[PDB]
Design a protein around this ligand. Sequence first.
Ligand SMILES: [Cl-]
Ligand SMILES: [Zn+2]
Length: 311
Amino acid sequence: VRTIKVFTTVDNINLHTQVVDMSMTYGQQFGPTYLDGADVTKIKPHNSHEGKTFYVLPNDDTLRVEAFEYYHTTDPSFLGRYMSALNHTKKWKYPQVNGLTSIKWADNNSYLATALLTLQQIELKFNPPALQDAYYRARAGEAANFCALILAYCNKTVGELGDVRETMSYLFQHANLDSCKRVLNVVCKTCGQQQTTLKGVEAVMYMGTLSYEQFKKGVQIPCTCGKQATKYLVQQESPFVMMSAPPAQYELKHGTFTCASEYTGNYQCGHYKHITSKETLYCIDGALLTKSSEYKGPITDVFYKENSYTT
Ligand SMILES: [Cl-]
Ligand SMILES: [Zn+2]
């Protein structure tokens, strides 16, 4: 008999009018239900809920299409994981540090801070509307939805150990890198030379050396014949490149790179910091900021500006 009007949604844009019975839980009426990230499935409607928007899972064809068009995923657990993360990230603080949105440390989130800082320094356009909209808000300082989307797209929960390289790979999958192109040549003194072309995400990421100049000069890799061959960059067309390696002591020189991530710890436990090269070297550690003219530390990922390179 007693009812309120609420709206359900999967994208927080398209609303769906509902009349709910205040004697039944939201779960009994909608399935799993969330109010700005909080799980209200086991709760009965409150007077204050009238007119508010609730997220639900895509449980009919209209919602399935809305959810795919907004998020570009059909993983059945995506919206519940996004909501579970948002209930935490909405409580984080996002200070402006040296002109960039950072994240005050909470919930083991240092890998997310350095990823967020990196994104604001490289040219990248996302494809899912969810990421376009949330990234716009993040740049303005309201990064809770963007951070909870990063967790959901990477299948990481709040508090879980994350890797910056893997996180960036997920975000780049959902970005328009279609025009990026990389040409490599591999030279074996026994077998001869082989050229390879890479496209998209694989054209901007490399694992094995932090140094873009070393990649141009040549890096040693195994050949199937048993000798060590040399791999070198012949041609690059992209607005940035990302060079990654297992953490190692490495010296970062002012003016020779855009930004970098530093990892202190081991394979089970550690902490990330961000280094950015501007008028000097700034080290951003969540809300914390220090400066130096030189920098040495256990670097894992370095980003460089690019446009067009030909050997
Ligand atoms: Cl919706
Ligand atoms: Zn060979």
